[PDB]
Amino acid sequence: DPQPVWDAEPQFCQGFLIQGLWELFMDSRQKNADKFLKPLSWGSEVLESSCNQPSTALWQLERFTVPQALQKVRVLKHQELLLVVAVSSFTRHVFTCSQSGIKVWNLVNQVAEDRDPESHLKCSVQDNKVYLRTCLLSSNSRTLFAGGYNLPGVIVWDLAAPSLYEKCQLPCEGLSCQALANTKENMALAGFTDGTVRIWDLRTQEIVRNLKGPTNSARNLVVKDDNIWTGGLDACLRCWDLRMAKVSLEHLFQSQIMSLAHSPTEDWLLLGLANGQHCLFNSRKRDQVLTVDTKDNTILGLKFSPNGKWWASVGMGNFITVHSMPTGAKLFQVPEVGPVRCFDMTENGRLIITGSRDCASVYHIKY
Amino acid sequence: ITTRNTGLEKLKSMVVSPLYILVEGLSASRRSQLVLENISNESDRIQVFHSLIENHQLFDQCQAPSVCSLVCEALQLQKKLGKRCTLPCQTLTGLYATLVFHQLTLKRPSQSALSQEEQITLVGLCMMAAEGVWTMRSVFYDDDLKNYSLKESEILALFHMNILLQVGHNSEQCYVFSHLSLQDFFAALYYVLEGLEEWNQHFCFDTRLLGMKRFLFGLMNKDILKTLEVLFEYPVIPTVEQKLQHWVSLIAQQVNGTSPMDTLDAFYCLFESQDEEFVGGALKRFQEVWLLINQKMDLKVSSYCLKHCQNLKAIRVDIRDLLSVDNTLELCPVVTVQETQCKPLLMEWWGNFCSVLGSLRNLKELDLGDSILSQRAMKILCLELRNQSCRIQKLTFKSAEVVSGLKHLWKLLFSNQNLKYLNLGNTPMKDDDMKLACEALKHPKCSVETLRLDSCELTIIGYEMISTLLISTTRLKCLSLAKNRVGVKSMISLGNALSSSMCLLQKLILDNCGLTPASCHLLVSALFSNQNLTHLCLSNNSLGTEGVQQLCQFLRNPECALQRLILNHCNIVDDAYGFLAMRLANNTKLTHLSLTMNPVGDGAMKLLCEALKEPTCYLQELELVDCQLTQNCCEDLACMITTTKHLKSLDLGNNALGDKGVITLCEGLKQSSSSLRRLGLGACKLTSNCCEALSLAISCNPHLNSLNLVKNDFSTSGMLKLCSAFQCPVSNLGIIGLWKQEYYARVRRQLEEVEFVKPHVVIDGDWYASDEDDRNWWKN
Amino acid sequence: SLRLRTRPWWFPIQEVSNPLVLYMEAWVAERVIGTDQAEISEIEWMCQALLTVDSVNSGNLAEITIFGQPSAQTRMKNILLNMAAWHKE
């Protein structure tokens, strides 16, 4: 019985004053306390004050911080259902990925509802029928990746140049980009429906390596300098090191695998199954996998905190759940009306973006 | 493509892969020379010119050659109209209005009231100006003029100067103003004009809005309103003034504090209109201001506006960069504006700003945020704060890098006898600095009672000077030393000082120090003879069993007078729990105790609650957040709650009580013999079943005051039940900690109904922020 | 007086206004601007700040304008003052 109620979100003071001035003109021509949300200062911070804590922390342990609540500030409008989002905290440029079109937005301007993007990019103009499923961003913000189903290749855009243009088509004619991946190395990774993975060098645009497996096994892919992780409908789990070029571990499950995650400060591997079980595995000792959290709804996306303390989940059941690493228990809850497909996180740890229905929403983190 | 900056918002969408090359007009130096030429230079050239130059919006407008020429000729007009115009001209709005007024007088044979026909024309053209502003249309077709009964010939004849010029190459004609600034000014003029008289009978019908808002704020000047009354023979009282005052008041008050950007924007808007009554009426309810400064114009406007702030008591100002350096000399014009001022412009303005800050009487708290001050910067700040009329009694430097001006700070300490609380933090403190600070503190003029040194680097020599300061006769009552590694020999030196009977220190804080079980034992043995220490804090330092035994022995000694004892994250053994329970069985003058991140078993919990059950207990507050607990001890907890008569505050944290445990606790609570006020549960793994018992207990709990339920899964129906329990007249639950974003629409509406029913109920996620009593004396 | 400067797409239109201007001697600036404009573009992108150089006055003084967020302007002026300090030694 959710019975959800929707209200204007920001209620910014400038908007309130503008609304007040608009009414007076209409009244003149007709003859013929209040709570406002703090704006995003310069598109970087909110400038709020932190919350109190029951006790002081240890002198050595100052950097470890955990969040409490999430507050939404802006809503981004796209007429079609969105599939992926990108943050790009350095340039304050948010990218929204949908089935048909891609748009780019800037967070400098203050507005309740954003309808006009700074740049609009569509891949359906080039070909007769273009269906897009995947997208990816680079840490250096010098490249933008977008893969499609019937699109013959993958298109790279560069944000360093004064103008946006297509770098290379990098064709995969018979293979649809179910999975798209990238690394710190210049090297490109991608997975497709027919259990095939083909690998190209951006500098020279040549195929260097091909991998083959059973069908539906390329639904997921995890990249590391010495670890390549692969799993799909089969539920076989394979870890590969390019150096000695052989599968390291094989693992079996009762159901399919969709979600994987990695932790930067110390390796941990998170598993999401069709029956809704979260399994955690450490990549140092390499002994055993363990499960601590179970969800009735299928889990589609996952992400980890830059600090290495909390992970938030997005699933079929229109819910957002955030946990912690020591026990796996959830610490706060925020539900949404639509089925949440995507998720995102910021390297700075101040913002967060999630999208379920055609439009996208931007939230703010409190510490 | 050529267009305005405002039009790029729409254009950036349809155009594919465009290029942007920005066009700029007059250079800054040439503009400065041109403005300097027009200055009358009659003893106010420096101040007026400097006020003109810093205004960024004014120079953005003056970048236009036509606007620059208009400003120049207006300045020339002010020379001739030395006595006719009484108001000063430091703003664009005043200058443009002055030119409009002077031009109108040229058409009039003499100063007289406007005729009826021309007033209709003026209000009509002003209203189409406002309509064009709101509709974002500027073509101004002749059809609109006939719709409102306007003629171009009449407009050009009565105005006597070029307004809304039309040129038609083809058959059709289009009307364009001389500049957009004039059009916005006329729209602002209409926004006051409609109130005076109704003219609908004759008619037959957000960056861009920023200029209109600024013009509207400027037009509220009394002299302009008086002049308009003179032209129209009707007293001018606009209804928008109340709306502006209401908007400013709404900005002034907020639950979580004032955003600095909104405050500075309001200051900019109020400074535009040079009226003392307007600003005074606008701002009365701040009570706390947070300010960010990045330009000298900010300093000037803050100095102008702080005079009318007679209500505020706390101020926080951040200037990161404007005084990072002490000396820097550069000249903008080819020839200097002033021959020799012997001081650059920034220093005089900041001196005036600090004099204004120190002049206020209602203000008694000062904070510098993360300011980075040079040596001369800290010197001038101290010199301005040296004023006798200043009554600021608190200073904070825990985030300010002022190590260069520590000498000036020490000079400030003894000179001002009024301030009491002084805080220093994250400032590397050197040996001669310690010596000077201690010598200044020893001075009889010093009246500082509280001094704090957190993360301030300390030497062994520093420790011995600190001990000599303590043994010396001072007025220091409270002292803290946190996150400072202390040597055992230094600790021995500190201990000897404490054992002295002449020492009179009431609050001592030791957190994250280098305490060891031997060091802790020695410290407690030294403190055994002390009798003037009421508040003592020891956290994050390992404490042995013998240390706890010696501490309990000291507590048993009379004349101890130690009210609050705080211990967290220090490992406590099982036997030490026995000593603590024996002390608690017959304890007086010991109200508050804390234990957090400490291994406490369920049997130890039973022993503790049995010790509390004894009638000779005066422990008001007990905190046990991260102590590992299970569901078995909850029955004894309920029993002790029912039996206890003096426990007021009880807190529990990450310990998993369990559903049955909470059920038993609420069964014990619903009988409501206990007079406890605050109950805290967080991440206790709650379910929807215990909510019925919780609502039942609340429904017969008039004593209960505060409650927290965070990080616990609560279903929808549980939320309705709890809201209904809140709405019952029997419940008096005022402080409640919950996250509203987690729940559905119906729960939010129910909570709004609860707030409607009881005007004194507040729901906020940050439950720990509220403090009924001083609990964070050590945390600060 | 009309000056045309290309504006990078990433910079917001709002940031361009309220420019910070620093006055420095022309000879030092000639060296300060550097021989290559590509490194100027690279530091511009990695700092997200806009700078323009122009000196027409007969005197040795020159004027420098920086465009962008206050933090970026602060870091630009810090770098330029460090370069000037290196020059005076």
PDB file of all heavy atoms in Angstrom, chain B residues 558-583:
ATOM      1  N   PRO B 558      36.506   9.852  50.438  1.00  0.00           N
ATOM      2  CA  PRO B 558      35.620  11.026  50.434  1.00  0.00           C
ATOM      3  C   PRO B 558      36.291  12.256  49.845  1.00  0.00           C
ATOM      4  O   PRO B 558      37.443  12.189  49.407  1.00  0.00           O
ATOM      5  CB  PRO B 558      35.287  11.223  51.919  1.00  0.00           C
ATOM      6  CG  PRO B 558      36.369  10.504  52.656  1.00  0.00           C
ATOM      7  CD  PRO B 558      36.729   9.334  51.796  1.00  0.00           C
ATOM      8  N   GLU B 559      35.557  13.371  49.802  1.00  0.00           N
ATOM      9  CA  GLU B 559      36.005  14.650  49.238  1.00  0.00           C
ATOM     10  C   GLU B 559      36.430  14.518  47.774  1.00  0.00           C
ATOM     11  O   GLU B 559      37.030  15.438  47.206  1.00  0.00           O
ATOM     12  CB  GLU B 559      37.122  15.286  50.085  1.00  0.00           C
ATOM     13  CG  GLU B 559      38.556  14.887  49.744  1.00  0.00           C
ATOM     14  CD  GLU B 559      39.580  15.554  50.640  1.00  0.00           C
ATOM     15  OE1 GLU B 559      39.175  16.309  51.549  1.00  0.00           O
ATOM     16  OE2 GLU B 559      40.791  15.326  50.434  1.00  0.00           O
ATOM     17  N   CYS B 560      36.095  13.394  47.139  1.00  0.00           N
ATOM     18  CA  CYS B 560      36.446  13.194  45.737  1.00  0.00           C
ATOM     19  C   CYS B 560      35.724  14.193  44.842  1.00  0.00           C
ATOM     20  O   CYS B 560      36.350  14.865  44.014  1.00  0.00           O
ATOM     21  CB  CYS B 560      36.120  11.760  45.322  1.00  0.00           C
ATOM     22  SG  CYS B 560      36.429  11.390  43.586  1.00  0.00           S
ATOM     23  N   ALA B 561      34.405  14.307  45.001  1.00  0.00           N
ATOM     24  CA  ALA B 561      33.585  15.275  44.272  1.00  0.00           C
ATOM     25  C   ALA B 561      33.797  15.166  42.764  1.00  0.00           C
ATOM     26  O   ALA B 561      34.011  16.159  42.067  1.00  0.00           O
ATOM     27  CB  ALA B 561      33.856  16.698  44.763  1.00  0.00           C
ATOM     28  N   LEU B 562      33.740  13.939  42.259  1.00  0.00           N
ATOM     29  CA  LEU B 562      33.904  13.661  40.835  1.00  0.00           C
ATOM     30  C   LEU B 562      32.548  13.249  40.273  1.00  0.00           C
ATOM     31  O   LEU B 562      32.121  12.105  40.436  1.00  0.00           O
ATOM     32  CB  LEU B 562      34.956  12.581  40.613  1.00  0.00           C
ATOM     33  CG  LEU B 562      35.331  12.285  39.163  1.00  0.00           C
ATOM     34  CD1 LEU B 562      36.838  12.191  39.018  1.00  0.00           C
ATOM     35  CD2 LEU B 562      34.669  11.002  38.694  1.00  0.00           C
ATOM     36  N   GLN B 563      31.879  14.185  39.598  1.00  0.00           N
ATOM     37  CA  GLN B 563      30.537  13.924  39.089  1.00  0.00           C
ATOM     38  C   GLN B 563      30.567  13.026  37.858  1.00  0.00           C
ATOM     39  O   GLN B 563      30.014  11.922  37.869  1.00  0.00           O
ATOM     40  CB  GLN B 563      29.830  15.241  38.763  1.00  0.00           C
ATOM     41  CG  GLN B 563      29.109  15.871  39.936  1.00  0.00           C
ATOM     42  CD  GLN B 563      30.059  16.466  40.948  1.00  0.00           C
ATOM     43  OE1 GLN B 563      31.133  16.949  40.596  1.00  0.00           O
ATOM     44  NE2 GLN B 563      29.667  16.439  42.215  1.00  0.00           N
ATOM     45  N   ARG B 564      31.208  13.483  36.790  1.00  0.00           N
ATOM     46  CA  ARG B 564      31.145  12.823  35.495  1.00  0.00           C
ATOM     47  C   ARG B 564      32.468  12.133  35.201  1.00  0.00           C
ATOM     48  O   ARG B 564      33.527  12.764  35.256  1.00  0.00           O
ATOM     49  CB  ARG B 564      30.816  13.831  34.395  1.00  0.00           C
ATOM     50  CG  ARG B 564      29.804  14.880  34.821  1.00  0.00           C
ATOM     51  CD  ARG B 564      29.193  15.588  33.628  1.00  0.00           C
ATOM     52  NE  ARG B 564      28.823  14.658  32.569  1.00  0.00           N
ATOM     53  CZ  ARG B 564      27.734  14.772  31.823  1.00  0.00           C
ATOM     54  NH1 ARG B 564      26.881  15.767  31.993  1.00  0.00           N
ATOM     55  NH2 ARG B 564      27.495  13.863  30.880  1.00  0.00           N
ATOM     56  N   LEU B 565      32.400  10.843  34.888  1.00  0.00           N
ATOM     57  CA  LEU B 565      33.560  10.058  34.492  1.00  0.00           C
ATOM     58  C   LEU B 565      33.244   9.349  33.186  1.00  0.00           C
ATOM     59  O   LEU B 565      32.258   8.610  33.102  1.00  0.00           O
ATOM     60  CB  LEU B 565      33.936   9.045  35.574  1.00  0.00           C
ATOM     61  CG  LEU B 565      35.214   8.244  35.336  1.00  0.00           C
ATOM     62  CD1 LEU B 565      36.342   8.771  36.206  1.00  0.00           C
ATOM     63  CD2 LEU B 565      34.975   6.771  35.604  1.00  0.00           C
ATOM     64  N   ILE B 566      34.078   9.568  32.174  1.00  0.00           N
ATOM     65  CA  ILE B 566      33.827   9.084  30.823  1.00  0.00           C
ATOM     66  C   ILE B 566      34.972   8.168  30.417  1.00  0.00           C
ATOM     67  O   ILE B 566      36.141   8.560  30.493  1.00  0.00           O
ATOM     68  CB  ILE B 566      33.672  10.240  29.813  1.00  0.00           C
ATOM     69  CG1 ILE B 566      32.421  11.091  30.085  1.00  0.00           C
ATOM     70  CG2 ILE B 566      33.628   9.710  28.400  1.00  0.00           C
ATOM     71  CD1 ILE B 566      32.505  12.041  31.265  1.00  0.00           C
ATOM     72  N   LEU B 567      34.636   6.950  29.991  1.00  0.00           N
ATOM     73  CA  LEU B 567      35.613   5.976  29.521  1.00  0.00           C
ATOM     74  C   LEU B 567      35.056   5.256  28.304  1.00  0.00           C
ATOM     75  O   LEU B 567      33.996   4.629  28.387  1.00  0.00           O
ATOM     76  CB  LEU B 567      35.962   4.954  30.609  1.00  0.00           C
ATOM     77  CG  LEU B 567      36.138   5.434  32.049  1.00  0.00           C
ATOM     78  CD1 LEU B 567      35.894   4.291  33.019  1.00  0.00           C
ATOM     79  CD2 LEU B 567      37.525   6.018  32.249  1.00  0.00           C
ATOM     80  N   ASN B 568      35.765   5.338  27.181  1.00  0.00           N
ATOM     81  CA  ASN B 568      35.341   4.663  25.964  1.00  0.00           C
ATOM     82  C   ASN B 568      36.535   3.998  25.301  1.00  0.00           C
ATOM     83  O   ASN B 568      37.668   4.472  25.408  1.00  0.00           O
ATOM     84  CB  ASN B 568      34.682   5.627  24.969  1.00  0.00           C
ATOM     85  CG  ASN B 568      33.673   6.539  25.623  1.00  0.00           C
ATOM     86  OD1 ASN B 568      34.032   7.404  26.415  1.00  0.00           O
ATOM     87  ND2 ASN B 568      32.402   6.353  25.292  1.00  0.00           N
ATOM     88  N   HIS B 569      36.262   2.885  24.619  1.00  0.00           N
ATOM     89  CA  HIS B 569      37.243   2.182  23.793  1.00  0.00           C
ATOM     90  C   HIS B 569      38.484   1.772  24.582  1.00  0.00           C
ATOM     91  O   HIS B 569      39.527   1.465  24.000  1.00  0.00           O
ATOM     92  CB  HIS B 569      37.642   3.021  22.577  1.00  0.00           C
ATOM     93  CG  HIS B 569      38.056   2.203  21.397  1.00  0.00           C
ATOM     94  ND1 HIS B 569      38.680   0.981  21.522  1.00  0.00           N
ATOM     95  CD2 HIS B 569      37.932   2.428  20.068  1.00  0.00           C
ATOM     96  CE1 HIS B 569      38.925   0.488  20.321  1.00  0.00           C
ATOM     97  NE2 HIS B 569      38.481   1.348  19.421  1.00  0.00           N
ATOM     98  N   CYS B 570      38.384   1.757  25.907  1.00  0.00           N
ATOM     99  CA  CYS B 570      39.453   1.285  26.772  1.00  0.00           C
ATOM    100  C   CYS B 570      39.040  -0.062  27.340  1.00  0.00           C
ATOM    101  O   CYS B 570      37.993  -0.171  27.986  1.00  0.00           O
ATOM    102  CB  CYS B 570      39.735   2.279  27.900  1.00  0.00           C
ATOM    103  SG  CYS B 570      38.273   3.138  28.514  1.00  0.00           S
ATOM    104  N   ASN B 571      39.857  -1.083  27.093  1.00  0.00           N
ATOM    105  CA  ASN B 571      39.481  -2.436  27.473  1.00  0.00           C
ATOM    106  C   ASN B 571      39.336  -2.551  28.984  1.00  0.00           C
ATOM    107  O   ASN B 571      40.223  -2.156  29.744  1.00  0.00           O
ATOM    108  CB  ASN B 571      40.519  -3.436  26.967  1.00  0.00           C
ATOM    109  CG  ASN B 571      39.899  -4.756  26.566  1.00  0.00           C
ATOM    110  OD1 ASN B 571      39.030  -5.281  27.261  1.00  0.00           O
ATOM    111  ND2 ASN B 571      40.340  -5.299  25.439  1.00  0.00           N
ATOM    112  N   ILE B 572      38.204  -3.101  29.415  1.00  0.00           N
ATOM    113  CA  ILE B 572      37.885  -3.274  30.825  1.00  0.00           C
ATOM    114  C   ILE B 572      37.670  -4.757  31.085  1.00  0.00           C
ATOM    115  O   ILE B 572      36.873  -5.404  30.394  1.00  0.00           O
ATOM    116  CB  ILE B 572      36.646  -2.455  31.230  1.00  0.00           C
ATOM    117  CG1 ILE B 572      36.957  -0.959  31.186  1.00  0.00           C
ATOM    118  CG2 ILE B 572      36.180  -2.849  32.616  1.00  0.00           C
ATOM    119  CD1 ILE B 572      38.274  -0.587  31.824  1.00  0.00           C
ATOM    120  N   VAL B 573      38.379  -5.292  32.076  1.00  0.00           N
ATOM    121  CA  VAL B 573      38.321  -6.719  32.360  1.00  0.00           C
ATOM    122  C   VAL B 573      37.086  -7.041  33.195  1.00  0.00           C
ATOM    123  O   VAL B 573      36.410  -6.157  33.729  1.00  0.00           O
ATOM    124  CB  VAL B 573      39.605  -7.193  33.060  1.00  0.00           C
ATOM    125  CG1 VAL B 573      40.826  -6.571  32.400  1.00  0.00           C
ATOM    126  CG2 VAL B 573      39.556  -6.850  34.541  1.00  0.00           C
ATOM    127  N   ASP B 574      36.796  -8.339  33.305  1.00  0.00           N
ATOM    128  CA  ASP B 574      35.617  -8.784  34.042  1.00  0.00           C
ATOM    129  C   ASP B 574      35.701  -8.407  35.515  1.00  0.00           C
ATOM    130  O   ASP B 574      34.703  -7.986  36.114  1.00  0.00           O
ATOM    131  CB  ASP B 574      35.447 -10.292  33.882  1.00  0.00           C
ATOM    132  CG  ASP B 574      36.749 -11.045  34.059  1.00  0.00           C
ATOM    133  OD1 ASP B 574      37.674 -10.496  34.693  1.00  0.00           O
ATOM    134  OD2 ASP B 574      36.849 -12.184  33.559  1.00  0.00           O
ATOM    135  N   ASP B 575      36.880  -8.560  36.124  1.00  0.00           N
ATOM    136  CA  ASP B 575      37.028  -8.212  37.533  1.00  0.00           C
ATOM    137  C   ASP B 575      36.791  -6.725  37.759  1.00  0.00           C
ATOM    138  O   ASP B 575      36.213  -6.327  38.778  1.00  0.00           O
ATOM    139  CB  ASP B 575      38.413  -8.618  38.036  1.00  0.00           C
ATOM    140  CG  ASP B 575      38.763  -7.971  39.363  1.00  0.00           C
ATOM    141  OD1 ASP B 575      37.987  -8.137  40.328  1.00  0.00           O
ATOM    142  OD2 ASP B 575      39.811  -7.297  39.443  1.00  0.00           O
ATOM    143  N   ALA B 576      37.235  -5.888  36.820  1.00  0.00           N
ATOM    144  CA  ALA B 576      37.002  -4.453  36.937  1.00  0.00           C
ATOM    145  C   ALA B 576      35.512  -4.140  36.958  1.00  0.00           C
ATOM    146  O   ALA B 576      35.079  -3.186  37.618  1.00  0.00           O
ATOM    147  CB  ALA B 576      37.693  -3.717  35.792  1.00  0.00           C
ATOM    148  N   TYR B 577      34.711  -4.931  36.241  1.00  0.00           N
ATOM    149  CA  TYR B 577      33.264  -4.759  36.301  1.00  0.00           C
ATOM    150  C   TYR B 577      32.747  -4.996  37.713  1.00  0.00           C
ATOM    151  O   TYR B 577      31.821  -4.315  38.163  1.00  0.00           O
ATOM    152  CB  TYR B 577      32.575  -5.699  35.312  1.00  0.00           C
ATOM    153  CG  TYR B 577      32.849  -5.374  33.862  1.00  0.00           C
ATOM    154  CD1 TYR B 577      33.350  -6.339  33.000  1.00  0.00           C
ATOM    155  CD2 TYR B 577      32.602  -4.108  33.353  1.00  0.00           C
ATOM    156  CE1 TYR B 577      33.603  -6.052  31.675  1.00  0.00           C
ATOM    157  CE2 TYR B 577      32.851  -3.810  32.027  1.00  0.00           C
ATOM    158  CZ  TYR B 577      33.352  -4.787  31.194  1.00  0.00           C
ATOM    159  OH  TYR B 577      33.604  -4.500  29.873  1.00  0.00           O
ATOM    160  N   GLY B 578      33.336  -5.951  38.426  1.00  0.00           N
ATOM    161  CA  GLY B 578      32.976  -6.193  39.809  1.00  0.00           C
ATOM    162  C   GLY B 578      33.275  -5.011  40.707  1.00  0.00           C
ATOM    163  O   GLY B 578      32.451  -4.635  41.547  1.00  0.00           O
ATOM    164  N   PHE B 579      34.457  -4.414  40.536  1.00  0.00           N
ATOM    165  CA  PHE B 579      34.800  -3.218  41.298  1.00  0.00           C
ATOM    166  C   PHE B 579      33.836  -2.082  40.993  1.00  0.00           C
ATOM    167  O   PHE B 579      33.374  -1.383  41.903  1.00  0.00           O
ATOM    168  CB  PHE B 579      36.234  -2.791  40.985  1.00  0.00           C
ATOM    169  CG  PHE B 579      37.278  -3.575  41.722  1.00  0.00           C
ATOM    170  CD1 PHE B 579      38.070  -4.493  41.055  1.00  0.00           C
ATOM    171  CD2 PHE B 579      37.471  -3.390  43.080  1.00  0.00           C
ATOM    172  CE1 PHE B 579      39.034  -5.216  41.729  1.00  0.00           C
ATOM    173  CE2 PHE B 579      38.433  -4.110  43.759  1.00  0.00           C
ATOM    174  CZ  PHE B 579      39.215  -5.024  43.083  1.00  0.00           C
ATOM    175  N   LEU B 580      33.518  -1.888  39.712  1.00  0.00           N
ATOM    176  CA  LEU B 580      32.590  -0.831  39.330  1.00  0.00           C
ATOM    177  C   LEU B 580      31.213  -1.066  39.933  1.00  0.00           C
ATOM    178  O   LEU B 580      30.573  -0.128  40.420  1.00  0.00           O
ATOM    179  CB  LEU B 580      32.501  -0.739  37.807  1.00  0.00           C
ATOM    180  CG  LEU B 580      33.699  -0.103  37.104  1.00  0.00           C
ATOM    181  CD1 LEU B 580      33.664  -0.399  35.614  1.00  0.00           C
ATOM    182  CD2 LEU B 580      33.734   1.394  37.355  1.00  0.00           C
ATOM    183  N   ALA B 581      30.742  -2.314  39.912  1.00  0.00           N
ATOM    184  CA  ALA B 581      29.443  -2.628  40.495  1.00  0.00           C
ATOM    185  C   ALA B 581      29.441  -2.404  42.000  1.00  0.00           C
ATOM    186  O   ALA B 581      28.456  -1.909  42.557  1.00  0.00           O
ATOM    187  CB  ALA B 581      29.057  -4.069  40.165  1.00  0.00           C
ATOM    188  N   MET B 582      30.533  -2.768  42.678  1.00  0.00           N
ATOM    189  CA  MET B 582      30.609  -2.537  44.117  1.00  0.00           C
ATOM    190  C   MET B 582      30.588  -1.049  44.434  1.00  0.00           C
ATOM    191  O   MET B 582      29.943  -0.622  45.399  1.00  0.00           O
ATOM    192  CB  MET B 582      31.858  -3.195  44.698  1.00  0.00           C
ATOM    193  CG  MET B 582      32.065  -2.898  46.177  1.00  0.00           C
ATOM    194  SD  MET B 582      33.307  -3.932  46.975  1.00  0.00           S
ATOM    195  CE  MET B 582      33.702  -5.081  45.662  1.00  0.00           C
ATOM    196  N   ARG B 583      31.290  -0.239  43.637  1.00  0.00           N
ATOM    197  CA  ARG B 583      31.207   1.207  43.818  1.00  0.00           C
ATOM    198  C   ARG B 583      29.788   1.708  43.577  1.00  0.00           C
ATOM    199  O   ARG B 583      29.274   2.535  44.338  1.00  0.00           O
ATOM    200  CB  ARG B 583      32.184   1.926  42.890  1.00  0.00           C
ATOM    201  CG  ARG B 583      33.627   1.476  43.005  1.00  0.00           C
ATOM    202  CD  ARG B 583      34.153   1.610  44.421  1.00  0.00           C
ATOM    203  NE  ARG B 583      34.230   0.319  45.092  1.00  0.00           N
ATOM    204  CZ  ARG B 583      34.790   0.125  46.278  1.00  0.00           C
ATOM    205  NH1 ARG B 583      35.339   1.119  46.954  1.00  0.00           N
ATOM    206  NH2 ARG B 583      34.805  -1.100  46.796  1.00  0.00           N
TER     207      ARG B 583
END
